[PDB]
């Protein structure tokens, strides 16, 4: 589900197969290091700093769900455990750096819950700026003073 964006042979960010689309932050330079994915036609969206396309039928089995269901508690992400509460995802400051955009925040059943775009440092913890699903539609939560990773 996770694929890496390379630029001049160097990993800049990541791309993710969530739902039935293929995501990757718009700000990330490079092209997805995967033939099938690279040749796709992406639709940019500067508001969300998102850039989605549709998953080829032969990889659709490789997507990661998603879900609007996110009860206060702890979620999972590559660097550890994210914490959700008060309508805000946070992490121990330092555990997320530039070049982590695109990385999904899974729950314990594997459903992708949000996609990190950047984070605002508010001391001990950093409030993440994420792309999250509402009732059915996509949304973007950006804490005051976010630093786009």
């Amino acid at each position: 589900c996770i694929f890496e964006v390379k630029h001049e042979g160097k990993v800049m960010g990541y791309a993710c197969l969530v739902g039935d689309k293929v995501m990757k932050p718009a700000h990330v330079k490079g092209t997805i290091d995967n033939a099938d994915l690279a040749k796709l036609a992406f639709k940019r969206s500067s508001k969300y700093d998102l850039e989605c396309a549709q998953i080829p039928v032969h990889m659709k089995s490789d997507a990661s769900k998603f879900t609007h269901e996110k009860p206060e508690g702890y979620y999972n992400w590559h660097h550890g455990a994210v914490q959700y509460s008060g309508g805000r995802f946070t992490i121990p400051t330092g555990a997320g750096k530039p070049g982590d955009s695109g990385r999904p925040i899974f729950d314990n059943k594997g459903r992708v819950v949000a996609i990190v775009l950047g984070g605002a440092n508010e001391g001990a913890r950093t409030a993440l700026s994420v792309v999250t699903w509402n009732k059915d539609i996509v949304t973007k939560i950006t804490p005051e003073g976010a630093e786009e990773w």
Binding site: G19, D20, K21, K43, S45, Y48, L50, C52, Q54, D136, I137, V138
Partner: protein, 81 residues
């Protein structure tokens, strides 16, 4: 001499050219060309506006189609697949 009949419709319109002239018609033609350009510019703007409408709905999932069709055409033809 040369009879500058009125019409009609147009026809007799070009007849006036002979009456008072060299010119007249060429300027009118230029004006017509300008009008065509305005019409063409409007259409180009309209198509760009139609894209502006189709935007958002470009990312992406269940939700038109629907739009579609209501759709100007393009809506729909993405909607596909």
């Amino acid at each position: 001499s040369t009879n500058g009949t009125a019409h009609g419709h147009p026809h007799e319109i070009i007849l006036y050219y002979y009456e008072l002239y060299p010119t007249m018609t060429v300027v009118i033609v230029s004006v017509a060309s300008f009008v065509l350009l305005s019409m063409v510019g409007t259409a180009v703007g309209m198509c760009v506006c139609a894209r502006r409408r189709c935007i958002t709905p470009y990312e992406l999932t269940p939700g038109a189609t629907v739009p579609f069709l209501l759709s100007l055409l393009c809506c729909v033809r993405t909607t596909k697949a």
